[PDB]
Structures are given as C-alpha cells and as structure tokens.
Nucleic acid binder design. Structure first.
Ligand SMILES: [Mg+2]
Ligand SMILES: [Mg+2]
Lengths: 862, 869
RNA sequence: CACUGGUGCAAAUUUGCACUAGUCUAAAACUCCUCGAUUACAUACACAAAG
RNA sequence: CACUGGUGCAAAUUUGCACUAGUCUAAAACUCCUCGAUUACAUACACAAAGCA
C-alpha cells in the first residue's frame, strides 16, 4: 500500500472559498501552516507563509492541475501534481458539497446560515464523528448497566432518568410539581436504581459503596452514582431519538446548565484521582527519580523532577510526533535482546519507564531538531516497510548513544536495589512541582464529564473513545483558527448549542490528560460475595451452589491470617482481571462457560492468535507438553483445556507456594489467563462488530431528521414506523426525476437499483427488530443460544450475522427457511436488514459485505 | 559559485599554434590528447584529423577573432561554444604568443638547442620548470632536516656538510680523501663533510628516516650501511646543486643525466632500497593477503580465483583504481554517508581499513572489469560538470546506483568484519600458488634509475610530502609525454629533439607509470625500527620532562637496561604512541622536542590551531580526552579545555599507564592515548603549516636564481652582475629598462605601469643586506628553527602567513648593522608589517603574480577566503 | 581576492567594472592523482608482546 | 477489496481498466495518539497478606 504523495510532500489541505483557494502545509502535529492564497479565476498566487515557516513551493496552477514541490527534500524537490479541487465535471460551483447533500442544512444548524466555502462543513463532519463515537459508548454503557440488573422485554431504566432532576426530586418524585405521569416514571426508574445498588455489581466499575453504614456517606455515594447515571442517560437522549423521533439539543451545554451538585460530583471523582497522583509525587516516584537524577549527569535534579511529572501525568512523550515506545522496542529487538529475558519480567514496567524517559528527554529537551527531523522522515515515508526502516535506522543511532545507560538501568533493576532505593531518603521539597501540577479546577466540566464516563469502560474502550475525541477536537480547533485568520476571514459563529467548540484547543489538551489519568489502574474495590459467584461460575461450578457454600469454600466468614489462600488466588487471577470484568459486564458468567464448551468457536479464536504466542501458552499451560506436537496439536490441546476447565481444578492451589510448588501455581495462573483472554477476545470482537451497527442506526436517525427539513415527502413520516423510509424515499426520486440531493444514489444508478431490490426484501417489522437488537446487544445476550448451531466459524462478522438472523426470525420471514437449514448467515438477509442504510452507499456495502467490513482483514489484496 | 571554463567542459583540451597552422585537441582518457583538427591561420580552412568514432568535438566557423565548436557527446545538448582565436592579440605581429617572462627563446635553446615558431615546445618546457620548482622545495627541506639532526649551531657552516658532498666521488674517495689525487683544498673540504657525516651517524637519529644502523657491529654490514647512507646524501646534495646556484651564480646541468653517468655503486644503492621494499611486498603476497583474498573469492561469484588474485595485486601495488578518472574513495564515502551509516559505527573502527579495502575493491572491479562503459560515462558527466555542487551531485547519484547493486555485498563484508572471522581466516591453509602472480609482479629491474632515485628521496619524507612531490612529478611527466607525442605525430610533425642533458624526457611515458608505482610503495608503512635511547629522550622531552634529566635516569625510568617479562609497559606505551607517530617524527625532523613543548604552552597559538579544526572533530576530541567533561560546555569552552590540557601535558601524567590495562584502568589508558594523539596533531599542524609557508618562499628564491641566469644571456646590463651581491638586481634592472629603454622582454612589468612603479617603491624600501638575510632565512627554515624565540611576542594569531612573517621580521631585525626602518613598528605592534613584507619580496617583483601572492595575505593561500570574492 | 588575453557597458585620467578565456601566469588547464585536513596515511583485524 | 473526484487507455457499453487524489466517504487525510492484539493496560519492583450478609 502506498501513501498519498501530496500528503507526504507536505500538502495538508486545499480550502475552497467563493473565488479563492487556500493551501495549507503540515505544521507540528495537527497545526496547519497557511502557505498560499490562489485566485480561482486567473490563478494568481500570493504566498502567505514566511520563508522560514514555508514547507512547500507552489508552481504553475491552472484549471485542472496544481503544481508544487517540497521545500524540505521530499522526492529531492521534484515537482508534484495534484488535482485543482474546483475542477469537477457537471458542477457549476468550485466548492463541492457532501455526498449526502446535507451541507447547507448542516451549516444552518451549526452556524445559522449557508456558506460558499468547504471549510465549515469539514469542521461540522468532525463534530458528527464525536456524536458517532458517543453513540457507540452510551449504548455499551447503558447495556452494561441493564445487564447488571439481569433484565428479562427490554425496560430500559436509563430512559426515565433526567439530569434536570436533582437527587432530591429523584428520591422524592411526589415531593415536586412535575407531571403526574412524570412522577410515576421516576418511581419506576428509582426502583431499578435501588435494585442496581443492591446487586453490588457497581463494584466492577470501581464504584464501591461505603464501608461505614453512615447514612451521610451512604447517601453521598448514592448521590454521586445517581449523577453519573443521569449524565449517561442525558447523553443517550442527545444522540438517539425517542419514539416521537425527537432528540435533546443540549449535549454540549447541559453540564454547565444543570444543578451545580452534578458538577460537585464530577469535581469529586476527578479530585480523587488527581489528589492521589499529586500527593507526595516525588516520594511516590523516588525510586525512578533517584535513578534518573544519578544517571542524567547533564541535568539539574529539579528539572528532572518536573520532566518526570510531565512524563507520568501530561505524557508529553506521546505528543512528539513519533512513538518513543516503538523506538525502545526496536532497540531491544536488535540490541537489547538481553533485557527481554524472563529475569526482568517482574521489573519490566519500571525498566521501560526509565528507558522511555531517557529517550523522551533526548527529543524533548536535548535534541529537539532530531525529533523534528524524524517527524519529517516519517511524514516523507511512503510505505509501512519504509516507516519500519526509519524507526530501525533511528534505533541504531539511539543504541549507540544510550546503550551504556540502558545497561546501567538493567543493573539497577532488581528487588535488592529497588527495595534499597525505596527505603532511601530523598532530600527533596514538595513545592518543586507546584507549577507543573494539574488540578480538577484547571479542567472544563465537559472534560470532567468524559473522565467520569471512563469508570464504565475498560482500557481499550477508554483509548478508542478518548483518542477519537482528542482527534476531533484537534481538527475542529484548526478549522476555527484557519477561518479566523487574517488571510481567510470567514464569519464562522457557532449557534448557541455549539458554543463549546470555541474552546476546542483547551478541550483537546484536557482530554489528552484525561486519557492519561483514566488509564491508570483504579484502587480495587473489596471483592463481594456476588463477585465470587461470578468468578466461580465463569470457571465452572455446580448450578445449585448456595451463597453459604461459596462462603465456606473460600472461608469468607472465618477470621485469621494466611487461611484465605483460595479466596486470594480467585481475587488476584479472576476478580481483578480486566478480561473477567469485561466478560461479566457485557455477558454472563454461566453462558460464557457454556460457550467455552464449543471447540469450533474456541478454535476459531485460538487460530487468530500468533503461532509464537500459541507456543508460549502451550509451554505455560500444559502439565505434560508434547515437544513434537504440531501447532494445530498445540491449539487443539489449549482448546480442550478451555473446554474442561472447572473451579475444582483450583481448589487445592497453594497461594504461598515454595520450591517446585510454584510450578503448579504458575501453571494454574497461566490456564486462567488463557481462558479469560480467549473468552474476552470472542465477546470483545462481537461487541466491536455490533458497534458498527450502532453507528448506522445513529446516523440513520440523525440523517432522517436532516433530510426531513429538505424533503417534503418525509413531512408526515415517522422513522420508528418504518426504518426503510429514508432509503426508499431517496431511491424513488433518483429514478423519478434527476431529483435527489444525495450524490451517492444519484451518481450510481446500478448502486441505486441494487439498494431498491434490498429495500423490497425487507419489512417494517424486521427492520424494527434489527434496530432494537443492535441497541440492546441482543447478539451478545443470545450468543450461547444459537452459537452452537453454526456449522463453520470463520469470521466475527459471520458469527454476528448468524446470531442476529436467529434472533430476528424467532417466534414469518422469507429467509428463515434457508437460515435454519444452512446453519450459516444468509448474505441477502444481511443486505435486506441493512436496507435502511442504503442511502449511505459506503456504509451499506461495508456493513453488508464481509470482505469489506473490517479494515484489518484481507490486507494481502492488490 | 565558481564556474569551470565551458571550453574545457565541452571537450577542448588545447589549441596548439604553429607558424601557419593551429592544431585543436580534445580530452582523451586521463591526460591523453586527441588530435581533432588542423586549421590554416590564413584562409581558416579546416581539416579533421580525428576519426568519426574518436572525435569528441565538432568545429564550427573559424575566423581571425573566434573559434566556434560544440561537443559531439551532449554537452549543453550540442550548444555552440565561442572561444578566442589564440593568434588574435593586440600589439603582437606573431600568431605565436610569448611567455610573460619573455624567456621563451632562451628556454627553447636550453632544452632543444634552437628556437621554434610554435607554442608547443614552451608548454613542455614549463612542465620541466615545474619539476625543478617542486624538487627545490623538497631538497631544501631534506637538507634542513639533515642539519637539524646534527643539532647544528647555525655557524658559518650551514652548507659545509651537504655542500661539500659530490656524487662524482665514490664512497672510497669520500672516506679516504688523503689517498686521492684530488687537490689539497678539495681534500680539506671533503674532510669537513666526512666529519659531519660521522657526526650524523653518531647521533643515531637516522632511524627517524628509516635508516637504522645494523644491529650487529660487523665492519662489512656497517660499511655497507654507511656506504648506502653516503650515496643517498650525495644524491640529495647533487640535486640541490642542480636546482640552486653557488656564490658565483653557477649550477649543474646534469640533474636528469647524472644518475646513469656516476659510478655504478650509486645505482647499486638505489637498487638495494627499492628491492628491499618490493621483495617484502612480493614474497608470499597471496599468503600475506589471504584474509581479503579468501573473502573476495567467496563473494565474487562471477570471477575465477586466479583472476581475483591478479586484480588484488593490482589493487594493492599498481593501484589501477586510482587511474579510473573518478574517485572510488569518494563514491564509497557517499554510499556510507547516505545508506551505510551502520558501517561508520565505532564497533568497526579496529577493522575499518580492511573493510574499506574490500568495499573499494568491489567498486574497482565493477568499473575496471564488469562495467567499463559506466566508468567512461561517469568521467564524461564529471568533465561536463560546471560547478563543485554539480560534481558532488554526480557522485551522489552514482552512489545511489551503486548501493542498489552492492548493498548485499557491503552487508556481507560487514558481517565478516570482526575478530573471530578474521582470526579464523588467518589460520586457514590457502591452497593458491604464489606462481599465479609471476607475470604481474613489479621488480626493481622494471624501473628506471630516475624513478628509483625518487623512491630513495621518499625515505626523508612524511606521507603528505611523498603525495605532494610524487603527484606533482607524475602530472608533469604525464604532460611532457603528451606534448612529445603530439609533436612527433604525422599531422603535426615538428622537430622537438631534446638536447643531451634532457634525453631522459624521451622516456616520460615510462617515468609517469613508474612514479605512480613509487607513490604506492613509498606510502607503505616502513618496518618499525628499534627505539634508541636518543628517541626516548625526544619522546619524553616533547611530552615535558625536567631539562637536567640524564640518560641513566631515562634508561632507569623506562627499564631499558632491565630484561624481563611484563616490565616494559611504559616503554612500549611511549614507543606505540609517540616514537611510532609520524606526527612526532615530523616534529623531531623539522623542529626540536624541547622548543615544541615550550610553544605548546602558548594557548593563543594552540587556540588558533584548535580553531581551524571542525566543530564535530573538537567534540570528538573533548569526549575522548577529558576525564570529567561538562555536557553543557560551549564549543569555545571545549577548545579552551583542550588547549589547557595541551599546555599542562607532561611525561609525568603517563608514568603509571598500564599497557595491559583492564576495565576502568583501560578507559584511563585510552584517554592517555587520546591526549598524546591530540597533542602531537596540534603541534604537527603548526610546524607543517609553517614549513609549507616557507616552501612558497623557497620556490621564489629558486625561480629568481633560475630567472637571473636566463635573463643574464639577453640583458647586457646584467652581464657583470652577481645575484648574491644584491638580490634586488633583476627586479630593479627590468623595472629601470621599462621606464627608459621601453624594455619589452618582461610582459608583467611592461604591461602594468602602475604595478611596475609599486615594485620600484618596494625595491627602494629594501636593501642588499636585508634581502640576502631573507634569502638565507628561507633556505635554512629559520622561521621554524626560531619559532619558540618569537611566537610568544605575537599579539593576535590570525593565520600561518602572519605567524611566518612576524617571526621572519623578528629574525631579519635581530642585532649581531644599521636599524631597519620597519623595526620600531614591528616591535611596538607585536605583528608583521605589510610594507616590510613587500620590501623583502621586492627581489621577486619581476614576476607580478608571485610577488602579489607572496606579499598580500588575502592572495597567499588558494584554500583561504573561498567565500570572499 | 590576483595576473594576462578577448569582448562589451560605463566612467573620465589615464580609470574602472561586467562577461568570457588562458598547460605557453601564481603551489594553479578538464577529469583524476593530491593538498588544504584535523577527519592523518599505510602490502598484514585490533590488543598485548618483543627484534 | 469499497466509495467519489481527476487524468489516461480502451475496444467494448451502461461499460472496463491503469495511474492518482480525497479531513467536505466508510470505525477511515500525513505524522502522532489509538485499534487490530493475543503480545493486555496501568502514578507505587515482584510475591505473600489484608478483600463475608
Ligand atoms: Mg604552469
Ligand atoms: Mg470524515
């Protein structure tokens, strides 16, 4: 695969105004450098960049081509030719519209008027991306909270919550002046809130009820939990339509408009995390700081301390424009293969932090130019191999300069030294970090709200949500900046709902810090009896087991020291496992254990895992390994082990193992790690496939509201009655009269009629069931029921479609007969169910055809 | 930037002018001339002499004022180039241009016995004049080095030792003058030289020239050794007699003939020196190069092993890779700079010369054998190139193509470049017969005596001196052979019979090839000699030791008397890092160890030398030499630290060095080697630059004596004049003739009245006494000898030229006579006087470019002020 | 920041500038080989050890 | 193995190919930050211990 020569050469964007064109080049990060202004009529050019700032030299410009060359050596200064974007056939305007044709309507909603430019729409599409990611996360969180109850038919208790109602009104609905019917809705949802608290399952999210029976602390805890759930419910109302087809418009303003008590909760949660990190930070990191201060002979100790705090909390090394971790991995891969020995496994995080910090200070302070040089090389790179080679070449240069330092760090990486350093006094003052320290008061409420949301998410979910949000705010701030520049000077005033986007630069910086602090391991909640039941059940246990029996086996009631080995082993390897929490939150322990019985599903997951990893698992988990075993034999053994696992296998585990006792203990931990990882891989992949469908539904509801204003035919229609209405209406018009604003259907007749055939196969009832199943994660909920039937498991996509197809046809549909017959998903059934997304051709083809669905599959394809 | 002549770039080598014809030549391979056209100077009719295949240029219109031509090979896509017709000159009746000096007719008579109405013979003669200029520099340096060795006291007798030697006397006459039939005065003069010769042998300093006396004291071996030394010294004295005049203004004319006319014992010595060198290279060459030959045979799949071995012998001894028309070293350097940065890693430092030989050998076979056409194309692009940046671009583009071809081979070479692999290849039994090289080996009998004489001269020289003398000689011989070949061709057919003393030049083609081999073998590291106590005293003294130290103390400190195992670490460390350093040998040869150590204390002088060194190199020196180095230090702070280290160095700092160091002790030993290396380099840079400055003045004196002798034949007013009586006589006489008689012989003076009047003011500012003292100081390297005496007095050390002139001016003004008028300003200023330089250089005024270049600091060095204008 | 030829502009006293050449100038003609040069260089890896 | 521009080919037509772009397509603009991912991740070496309605 080759990257764009225009992107590589340094050309970031060509913005089109009414009679002018603005050309930008890449600045640091996502910064745009205004280079030239070009008149669209006589092609006159004005350079806007300074000679020092300029990255590209503009050559001839004509109606069809733009010519430029890099000022920094890309392709040795060779001329590059790109299309003049104003040049399009059968289009009068130089500025193009969106494929959906909603550009004018969207500009009105966001800026209050239409514009003869393509800049505002680009910013608006970025905001739409934020809503798409929020819709996926709100759906997942709402489902997990419902699953925590054990719903059984979907009464969504999140639905009756309102961030508008204070905790007092929520606890006392008949103690206010609200609609009689409203009072009733609160009661129903207040019951479920008390039910959820009863389960103790909120402990999984780090939300632990108070140890004391203090009514004050208890109500304080309940009030914070109520605010979090109400805020989640409020976000869901903003990105999903109700039965009336209406959505709240205060997604970006509500956190600052609602009662201030909610803000106190957001402040409390952030303060709790920031206060612990900020308290005696030097004392808390004295080991690594002391080693760094001795090693970094060129630096002042207070400067090293300030840099280390940034490295931990601000993570400035993640804003260099290159991966420091990738450089460290390359160094160890080719030179430091010694540091990869199992001997350093116990100290691997600490060692990597020291190595990463030395590399960080090298490019952030000592050699900034080298960092900028490396970014330019990576930007100029045209293939993945070239990029890997650039990291490899730089690793060689880094190894020559730090190999002695890395070896010194390796020498200090041992319990003796680390324990000694921990005891050692650090003669340092607390107030050195007074300037660098970040506090809750320094963050906007929207950023604090995103931090709060992270409580319900695992590490990957936090990374995916925060990285997407940070990228969108970063793009939105750049667009506002270009528009407000003297050279461009376009109006761009956001309407009342979107005033938040004026602080996009601050939000991008704050969200970055939130991603860092949210990724840190939360203080563990005390393991509850319910958690122990989930842990025993996932492993395999008697369906009839009682709470009294579980407590006796784990000696939960008994008081004493060293008699809780089994309880400790289950807590350390199961309850505290991120994979286990993900499985409990989105699935059910008993159903997961049953699904694990299926070798076909298990083998499919095992097949995905790399061969060397499978070999490591085989060596670690099998008591009597067959050395001459084939890779398929190793996968089969691992699969059989997962099939026969049970709680009974770990009843005699010795937490305090000594000598060869350790061998059995280590084997038991490896087996549980492998079992939890495989089940987690299956459930996570299914939730991820489902998220693509959540996006389509969110877009369809969103697009319906936008088209409705510009399509008179849709005026009486309700989406909930028939999800196929947007694609159906748009299709007919195309065939009807060159009348359509949707470029996808209008431009492609074959793609327009293709969707029609699919729309006809569908029905209002089926599509409604599909929309409900997508939002309710029914495919994960009913995985055990139909998963066993599947004849062959070859993709998550095929697994998801078969289960959904069984849930939809359950008690007719035309495809039901071939479905139960074939024991495989029906492709045409998929196109039919996806018919409501026909209007968006790329989304419809990506979600309908397996080969196009996953960006990571079929890399070896031309 | 600087642009090359488009005429040269397009392919026109020269326009030879005869009485009625013009011959146009283009560039063939290397220095070869391709006769392209004959043009009649009257009707401008043209005849093509070149074949269609050989032709490199197409001649367009030719008229009285201009010549139009274009390249047949794509220069400027066939653009018309316009050059002046050389026969068109204002105020000149003849189509044939004269030399600036007006000595063309006299020079033609000296070399050919008659004058010629052509510009060809003179061009050949100017090449011969170039050979004499370079020889004048080297003999002056060798004679000074021999005098320095004697620890001379600069008495009346500088010339006694070398001056009284005669190549016409055998070793027997020189050693027993009383038994000769020579005159009583001559016998007396021989005894003064014999006494100095015995003094030279007594010093035991000849080991510095690789002329170590035999270990055994048998008379036969000792007499054979002394005889060889006498032959070498007599030959050097003979050469000095040929390029410099005596008190009477007389010089020998047998420079090119004497080696073949003197006693055969002299030729035996030349054969012995060459044979010793060639026999060691020739004996078991395959076994001696088995590591590289074994690796190359495994790698070079398309070549037979015997072919690789023959090519490898050529690569080491013949160096055919240095005759390709482009630099293999430059191509290899570019490849490493851009794509092979891993190869530049410090892990390869110990095997770098071997690794480079392997890489360079692959590039050599690629252009010499596999892709000859690629090499020819590369030469054409380089000839066509108009600027240095264009040339660098051509090398860079070719390097990119070579990297694609040779990346796997270069990686394979690097994989083998380690001690374990080299050690194993070293132990392997190589089944290749030495007889494979029977037809390729060069022997002493294959070389002319003149070539052997040049080899002999190399004993007295360092590597840079050998490269400078040999490259200059090879280039002049290459030019002379081309002019002779052109003249003897059927198309030109001009007589060109050299007179008897110059018949050697008939063999110029053979001499050019032989000197090339001499350059290769002479640049070969000589076998380490046995360090004498004298050398240990020089090494300890240069490092810094108390002046009263005794021979016994030195023998005691280094355990020279003691016999044992592992007790000689300090002696070995001094030998490996000081005695064996060519920088140290150069310093001892041209200066004294004690004076150099004293000069090293002048931080201003050290800072000036350190200032010339590139910043990346200073950073390497700071890292390697300073025990506790500040990371934050500025480049000027780093230079200052290095200068302070040089000022503070002493022998005492190294007395606890352990040769067999380990761990942290080893780091200290490496630091000690680094400090000594930096110290020797800085001092060497200072002394070498001053000797090089002095060489320019030596050339001026050589030219003045040569020019005075030639002008004496055509200027009646110079007939009763003795040059040594007043060095200003040629400049004064030529200027005076121009002003009144309108003398027209010297074009530099006749043409530029303003410059002639300026020279007259400078002659008037000087006098016979000062110019004679200046001539003596230049010939005796007085500036280098007296450097410690006056260098401390300089206020600002700005350049080598200003250092040389300040010291020179202090030497001229020193009392021992009326005060020179420039003395008061010189003493007050603490810097050289520009007017004083012009007055001292006034004897060279007759040659305006030389006078300006030697007088004006800005014009002196071709490598300085590249940006300025 | 040269010297000399050729060829132009311009100044204006006997000037300069520009372009362009020159193996028949200056350590000095293209490409090499060199030198500047530190980065040395060098038929034998480097150390160590010894003649 | 997409979608849409632009630019070429075409002999084959509602078409096809190649090259090439695209933040105004799709989870989808460079470099990051991420994800794929197993290799988890994580202010405090690891272990043990502390962890019931
Ligand atoms: Mg010459
Ligand atoms: Mg987008």
């Amino acid at each position: 695969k080759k990257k764009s020569s225009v992107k590589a050469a340094g050309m970031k964007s060509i913005l089109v105004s009414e009679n002018k064109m603005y050309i930008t080049s890449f600045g640091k990060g996502n910064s745009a450098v205004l280079e030239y202004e070009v008149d669209n009529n006589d092609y006159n050019k004005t350079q806007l960049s300074s000679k020092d700032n300029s990255n590209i030299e503009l050559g001839d410009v004509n109606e069809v081509n733009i010519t430029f060359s890099s000022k920094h050596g890309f392709g040795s200064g060779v001329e590059i030719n790109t299309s003049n974007p104003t040049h399009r056939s059968g289009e009068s305007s130089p500025v193009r519209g969106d494929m959906l044709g909603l550009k004018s309507e969207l500009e009105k909603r966001f800026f209050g008027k239409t514009f003869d430019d393509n800049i505002h729409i680009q910013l608006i599409y970025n905001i739409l991306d934020i809503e798409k990611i929020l819709a996926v996360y709100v759906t997942n969180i709402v489902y997990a909270l419902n699953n925590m109850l054990g719903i059984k038919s979907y009464d969504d208790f999140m639905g009756y919550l309102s961030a508008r109602n204070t905790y007092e009104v929520f606890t006392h609905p008949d103690k206010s002046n609200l609609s009689d019917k409203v009072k009733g809705n609160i009661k129903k949802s207040l019951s479920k809130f008390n039910d959820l608290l009863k389960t103790k399952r909120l402990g999984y999210f780090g939300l632990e009820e108070p140890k004391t029976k203090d009514t004050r602390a208890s109500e304080a805890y309940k009030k914070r939990v109520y605010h979090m759930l109400a805020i989640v419910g409020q976000i869901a109302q903003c990105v999903f339509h109700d039965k009336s087809g209406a959505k709240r418009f205060d997604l970006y303003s509500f956190i600052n408009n609602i009662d201030p008590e909610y803000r106190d909760t957001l402040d409390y949660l952030v303060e709790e995390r920031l206060k612990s990190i900020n308290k005696d930070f030097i004392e808390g990191n004295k080991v690594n700081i002391s080693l760094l201060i001795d090693m970094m002979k060129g630096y002042e100790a207070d400067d090293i301390i300030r840099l280390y705090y940034d490295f931990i909390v601000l993570k400035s090394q993640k804003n260099l424009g290159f991966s420091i971790k990738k450089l460290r991995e390359k160094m160890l891969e080719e030179y430091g293969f010694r540091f990869k020995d199992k001997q350093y496994d116990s100290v691997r995080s600490k060692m990597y932090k020291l190595m990463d910090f030395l590399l960080f200070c090298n490019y952030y302070r000592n050699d900034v130019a080298a960092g900028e040089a490396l970014v330019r090389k990576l930007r100029f790179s045209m293939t993945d191999d070239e990029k890997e080679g650039i990291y490899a070449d730089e690793a060689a240069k880094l190894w020559g300069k730090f190999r002695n330092d890395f070896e010194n760090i390796a020498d200090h990486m041992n319990g003796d030294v680390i324990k000694e350093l921990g005891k050692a006094d650090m003669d340092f003052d607390e107030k050195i970090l007074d300037s660098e320290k970040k506090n809750a008061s320094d963050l906007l409420y929207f950023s604090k709200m995103i931090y709060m949301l992270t409580y319900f998410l695992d590490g990957k979910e936090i990374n995916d949500l925060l990285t997407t949000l940070i990228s969108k705010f970063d793009n939105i701030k750049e667009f506002l900046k270009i528009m407000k520049s003297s050279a461009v000077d376009v109006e761009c005033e956001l309407t009342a709902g979107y005033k938040l986007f004026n602080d996009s630069q601050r939000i991008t910086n704050e969200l970055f810090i939130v991603k860092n602090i949210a990724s840190m391991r939360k203080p563990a909640a005390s393991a509850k009896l319910t958690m122990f039941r989930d842990a025993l059940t996932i492993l395999g246990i008697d369906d009839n087991i009682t709470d009294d029996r579980i407590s006796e086996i784990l000696k939960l009631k008994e008081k004493g020291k060293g008699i809780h080995g089994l309880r400790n082993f289950i807590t350390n390897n199961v309850i505290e496992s991120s994979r286990f929490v993900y499985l409990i939150k989105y699935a059910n322990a008993q159903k997961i254990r049953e699904v694990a019985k299926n070798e076909k599903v298990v083998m499919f997951v095992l097949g995905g895992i790399p061969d060397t990893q499978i070999e490591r698992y085989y060596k670690s988990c099998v008591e009597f390994p067959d050395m001459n075993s084939s890779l398929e034999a190793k996968r089969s053994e691992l699969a059989r082990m997962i099939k026969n696992i049970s709680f009974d296998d770990f009843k005699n585990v010795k937490q305090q193992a000594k000598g060869r006792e350790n061998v059995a203990k280590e084997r038991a931990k490896a087996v549980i790690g492998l079992y939890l990882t495989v089940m987690y891989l299956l459930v996570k992949n299914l939730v991820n496939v489902n998220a693509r469908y959540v996006i389509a539904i969110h877009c369809l509801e969103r697009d319906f509201g936008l088209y409705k204003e510009i399509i008179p035919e849709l005026a009486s229609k309700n989406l909930k009655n028939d999800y196929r209405i947007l694609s159906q209406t748009l299709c007919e018009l195309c065939d009807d009269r060159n009348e359509s604003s949707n470029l996808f259907l209008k431009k492609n007749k074959r793609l327009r009629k293709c969707v029609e055939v699919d729309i006809n196969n569908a029905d209002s009832s089926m599509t409604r069931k599909y929309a409900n199943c997508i939002a309710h994660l029914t495919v994960v909920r009913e995985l055990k029921e139909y998963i066993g039937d599947i004849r062959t498991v070859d993709s998550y996509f095929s697994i998801y479609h078969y289960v959904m197809q069984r849930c939809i046809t359950k008690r007719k549909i035309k495809y039901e007969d071939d479905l139960l017959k074939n024991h495989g998903y029906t492709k045409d059934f998929v196109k039919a169910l996806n018919s409501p997304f026909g209007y968006n051709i790329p989304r419809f083809k990506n979600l309908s055809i397996e080969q196009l669905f996953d960006r990571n599959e079929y890399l070896t394809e031309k």
